[PDB]
Amino acid sequence: ADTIVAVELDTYPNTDIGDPSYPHIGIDIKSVRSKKTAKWNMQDGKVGTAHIIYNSVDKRLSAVVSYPNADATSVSYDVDLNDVLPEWVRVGLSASTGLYKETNTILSWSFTSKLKSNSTHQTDALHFMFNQFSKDQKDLILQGDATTGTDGNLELTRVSSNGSPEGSSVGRALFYAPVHIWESSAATVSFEATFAFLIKSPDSHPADGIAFFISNIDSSIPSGSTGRLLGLFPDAN
Amino acid sequence: ADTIVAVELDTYPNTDIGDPSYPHIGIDIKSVRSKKTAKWNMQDGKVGTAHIIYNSVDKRLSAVVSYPNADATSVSYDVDLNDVLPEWVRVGLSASTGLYKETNTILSWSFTSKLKSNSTHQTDALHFMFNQFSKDQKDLILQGDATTGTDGNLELTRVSSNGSPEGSSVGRALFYAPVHIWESSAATVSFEATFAFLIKSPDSHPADGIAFFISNIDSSIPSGSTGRLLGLFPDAN
Amino acid sequence: ADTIVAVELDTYPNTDIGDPSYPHIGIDIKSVRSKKTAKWNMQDGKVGTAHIIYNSVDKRLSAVVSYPNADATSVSYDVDLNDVLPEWVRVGLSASTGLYKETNTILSWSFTSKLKSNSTHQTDALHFMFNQFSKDQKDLILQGDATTGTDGNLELTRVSSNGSPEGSSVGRALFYAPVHIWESSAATVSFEATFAFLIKSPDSHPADGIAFFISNIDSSIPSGSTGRLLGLFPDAN
Amino acid sequence: ADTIVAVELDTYPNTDIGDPSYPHIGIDIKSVRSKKTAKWNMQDGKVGTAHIIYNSVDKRLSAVVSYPNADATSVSYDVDLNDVLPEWVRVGLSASTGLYKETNTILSWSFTSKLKSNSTHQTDALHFMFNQFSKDQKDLILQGDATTGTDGNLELTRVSSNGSPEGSSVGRALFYAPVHIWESSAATVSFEATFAFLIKSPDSHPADGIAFFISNIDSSIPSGSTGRLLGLFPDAN
């Protein structure tokens, strides 16, 4: 009854979830255990920047995760998505810190999709950039431990008044308006997500990762979602 | 209680409420009597595209309508527009009748709101444009006799089956997502719309009009806003 | 010497050069024989909009044509496309005839090229879209029988006065400004076009075709590229 | 024979040019001595960010010049511009350091204009953002002392290999493709420029300012332009 499709950014080799023994990534499509994974060297006190994309005539949800002067990590998945999802969708992103804390700060969120096909020569589109995270979005919908208004920062996890992030948050920020990838006439049908994230952790082998999901209109957290359950999979590794 | 700032495509002069000598688009700030105006040449069975532009800086509320081959019709009005509207503001369109028929028949809808200044310099945007209006809109919000679902079209007013419009309708649609023109850290909030309309009526006086509007978020059809009123105003002038 | 990578709206099967059984759009990488193809249903006196999308990441050259009410025609092709083109690359369109008439008649032109990765994360873009083609274009570049100046229209081919097209024309237009898909600091160069066409010909075999192309910057009409050739290719297959 | 219209950013009260005794700004329209000026507190080793804008139905070229957490400086000028310019235009920006050096580094240049009016429902547009100034633009046209490729920086003035900026440069960077603000049908006709500049100067009372011009297709430097002549006015204070 609860569907979703994000791109995993598992920083803790939660190899139990048979996952890669390490900082991988990947395209889970409803089951927490990914379709295609790939290696990714994290970085502390360092800003990250994920990228997604898809095309209707392409069939390939994918991404690549850089760190300036450094390297990054792509990925690609031949998929229809018109399979995975229903005609209307709500897009958000959410992190989870596990047994260990960290800071899943969202720094610069952007989302833009666009439709057309039909030849009717029309194309349509939703898009909004975010850069000045105030305190209350009215337009953003937070869920859990996602507090918002810090400094133009977006925090989807708990963390103190001084500098003390906990290790059990699980939040959920997503765009108030719902998206789409329906329409008859439909031919090609992009969207492109992308965000400057930046995790840190005092400790040496941090848990656990971040995500970016499309999904239900009214998707909600998982009684699961924890750690590896990414805050989006009921659980059932 | 409910505020609004928005431009009206009057198509029936109503010299009883200050609706001068003939068609006039109007810049209303709560009253059906436009602070500033200019005449209008309602073109039946024709394609015409309204406008509005704003400047944070600048600050000049200025719309424009325009039919093909023929000349357009300008008219603006200088205001502060952050002394009337609230912080976060949701929007759509609407329009009424009350004594004949008409097709407050909409063709396609465009919007964009740019918020900058910050000193982070980067622009926070939301923006969309419909070019296909199918059955139920979802991001949409209808609001009465307005209906969504007849031909990649959007009709705010009432109209029979085979094409026989009634004339005791009102019809309002908004945006599912609250919008946002203020940001503390601001110093240049801009927003721009534009939609094509196409009102028929087989009469020769089809009234009364329509209008491009904004407002609050718990803005609903004013129980008697009709003919004039414009499905906005609470009653009176 | 002159390179090019670009999609062709063949409208005359030429089984002599590998122009199979009927109309086929084609993905050419230097030769008039498309590496990948799919059939086509040339629709005279009709409105149809070609496409092309690319992915830095991804990298899949994939266009699409489409007439209304009716179904579209897909077909893509995976390439690296930064092993063939040069750094800085200028573009436009073109198309030919050589044995009957036709209206390689263009309606409107769209483009956009996004270059990101950087680690500055911010996007370097150029993008434009014509919807009005008046007399002389200026940012434009015509290139033969192609003419600029008959009705917010753009015709790459020859055609008489009152409407009597000849059939020994070629007609190429480009962009006045060199473009740019490579950036050292890159890791996701994207670009997207789309234009509406409208070829007539009162015959029933109007050939030969047209095609969406790129290339070098000192790219000019290949002295004999005609019928097929496509005003690109130097001669031969 | 040489026309141009920029927005002056005179950091040296070159009060001779009867100018404000200080760091003003302003809208010169062919004669170096401004139309409307206004005060502006510079800042060293500090990044600046100018903003322009105009509207066809508005009549108001203007700008505002901020410095985060700080203040800025707007300006506005009721003007047609369809007067000041010809139908086709080339847009650039250029600085000049006078008797004293400084660093007129251009950090983030952006330009976007758009047309439509006509009701033909079409709108057209040019736009490109710049953020990774390599060494040669092919697309940028430099003129004088504008060197380009430093670090993702744009320098329109001389300055050493170690850290030694001279005080006599005069450069000129502008977009290869030409812009426009012609078209019949014309109704409203924006553009919006905007850039993160950042001057510095070891010395206490630096010369002299920066600019941003529209102008000729092939405008060139002034045998003047120096210091206050901004690199765009033949001279004739």
XYZ file of C-alpha atoms in Angstrom, chain A residues 47-49 51 53 55 57-60 62-64 66-70 72 74-76 78 114 116-121 187-188 192 196, chain C residues 47-49 51 53-55 57-60 62-64 66-70 72 74-76 78 114 116-121 187-188 192:
68
model
C 29.453 19.275 1.283
C 27.941 16.582 -1.099
C 25.608 17.268 -4.084
C 21.902 14.526 -8.950
C 17.325 12.244 -13.818
C 13.537 10.279 -19.537
C 11.896 7.665 -24.109
C 15.195 6.654 -22.394
C 14.268 4.491 -19.495
C 17.085 5.068 -17.129
C 20.225 7.326 -12.498
C 22.572 9.705 -10.669
C 26.171 10.563 -9.868
C 30.546 14.199 -6.793
C 32.846 16.101 -4.294
C 34.757 18.932 -5.962
C 38.397 18.538 -6.975
C 37.612 14.946 -5.980
C 31.986 11.249 -7.454
C 27.384 7.619 -11.017
C 24.770 4.866 -11.519
C 22.121 4.130 -14.047
C 17.009 0.991 -17.266
C 8.479 18.468 -17.303
C 4.706 17.227 -23.103
C 4.794 14.411 -25.551
C 1.239 14.853 -27.094
C 2.775 16.819 -30.031
C 0.004 19.206 -29.089
C 3.239 21.265 -28.739
C 6.173 10.720 -24.924
C 9.236 11.891 -23.012
C 15.856 16.249 -12.497
C 24.045 19.857 -1.959
C 2.302 19.887 -37.632
C 4.916 17.447 -36.087
C 7.581 18.085 -33.568
C 13.001 15.786 -30.476
C 17.755 14.622 -25.487
C 21.229 13.788 -24.259
C 22.893 12.857 -20.989
C 26.148 10.657 -17.529
C 23.712 8.370 -19.417
C 24.969 9.416 -22.850
C 22.103 8.312 -25.119
C 17.663 9.899 -28.591
C 15.187 11.904 -30.675
C 11.487 11.224 -31.386
C 5.390 13.003 -33.435
C 2.225 14.051 -35.293
C -1.036 14.838 -33.407
C -4.004 12.614 -32.573
C -1.876 9.749 -33.961
C 4.661 9.104 -32.326
C 10.596 6.540 -30.908
C 14.286 5.502 -31.482
C 17.540 6.404 -29.599
C 23.929 5.048 -27.169
C 23.233 22.546 -19.310
C 27.316 21.088 -14.607
C 29.357 18.697 -12.470
C 32.031 21.541 -11.749
C 31.830 21.059 -8.020
C 30.843 24.646 -7.888
C 27.490 23.212 -8.606
C 30.679 15.390 -15.004
C 27.107 15.930 -16.538
C 17.901 19.527 -25.351
